[PDB]
């Protein structure tokens, strides 16, 4: 009979088209079935990089470190290399522009003891916060696979994580990336200088498709391939037009 | 001193371009200033038509008539003229397709006493539910102006209405219409066979512009002008590209 996970290697064409290597993982919520071009890489655990902004946001909201999605976190006045980081931000814009320094301040306020306890409650990856509490997701010991990202995102979608419903609703709002009459995408990018991520889901009228992709990213010039390759898979599968 | 409200008649060109007549009202939240092509019509009261799906959804959620945005309202099996109504719906899709029969059922469950009490608590328009409990917003006594729509929507945006924060967040989610890297639109269309409405807001990185427009709508052929004319005003004012 049918399997929980199927391999579709035809999606490899979308990686080889760009001389790139990686994995796309899809989960059809109605059918309770998953699909990927590479089951082994789908289960390989990597640093989450800025995809960690999802759980970090949830913890900061639930503890009151972030009061709501409108609270302003003033620029600290240090000019950094990414121009969009050199301004005031709220939770919405800090997630949109992947503003590391804002989330580093959240993490310090959360603190190591509460961060570790909450990642255990979330069943998040290897739950390991070794390194600094304000950088472990960029250069520390935490590791999560694409299928683990799907599992976490499905709990978030269903308000099943061990934080308040309010915190989960706010973070799902902050994840909003694209919407039109055909679909809604809620997602988060990540990049660690070695691999790039895009994780999230596509809401349709009568189904949800969760996705998690990562790919080798030797330079930042290819960052747009995260979304472009994912969308080629979504188009091939008739999920988006 | 500066003016809270200013008239810009140059926007009339966008109405005359289509041989149409109406009003667009904009509110700049950061500046606390409003703009319209027609101050008189901005403050005249009309049937809300399907824009009433905003308060109707809030009331149904807060009273528990609708449990959440996933609860399914099964099609009653009556084939209606609008094909998208002839299927099962949830709150998200019922708002997207303006599914009148679903909201008529909500209104009957809410009932006259609680509907009247909640519109009073909302300061919604003339607060008058005279007519049929399941059609007064289409052919009964309720009336609201475009400026009153803005005031109501501002309260919703700030979670200041007299229902739970949860109900307000769910309805704001259901209002999602369009999103990209430049803006997010949360809005609701309306149409009563005589007047057309579009009301909602545009979220930018550092500001939000509320809008409410209505226009004479003698035929359904021109329904797309509600968004088209509004977007021409938004583009003229450099709110969207
Ligand atoms: Cl949303």
Author numbering:
A (entry chain B), B (entry chain A): 21 to 261
Sentences reproduced from the published study:
The OXA-48 carbapenemase is widely disseminated in Enterobacterales, necessitating new treatments for producer strains. OXA-48 is a class D SBL that uses a nucleophilic serine (Ser70) to hydrolyse β-lactams, with a proximal post-translationally carbamylated lysine (Lys73) proposed to act as the general base for both the acylation and deacylation steps of the reaction. Diazabicyclooctane (DBO) inhibitors, including avibactam and nacubactam, act on a wide range of enzymes to overcome β-lactamase-mediated resistance. Here we describe investigations on how avibactam and nacubactam inhibit OXA-48 and two variants, OXA-163 and OXA-405, with deletions in the β5–β6 loop neighbouring the active site that modify activity towards different β-lactam classes.
Nacubactam is distinguished from avibactam by an extended C2 substituent bearing a 1-aminoethoxy group. Both OXA-163 and OXA-405 have four amino acid deletions within the β5–β6 loop, including of residue Arg214. OXA-163 also has a single amino acid substitution (Ser212Asp) adjacent to the deleted region. Crystal structures were obtained for OXA-163 and OXA-405, as uncomplexed enzymes and in the nacubactam- and avibactam-bound forms. Both OXA-163 and OXA-405 assemble as homodimers in the asymmetric unit. Consistent with their high overall sequence identities, they adopt very similar overall folds and active site arrangements compared to OXA-48. The exception is the Ser70 nucleophile, which is in dual conformations in one of the two chains in the crystallographic dimers of uncomplexed OXA-163 and OXA-405. The respective protein backbones only differ at the β5–β6 loop, which is truncated in the cases of OXA-163 and OXA-405, compared to OXA-48.
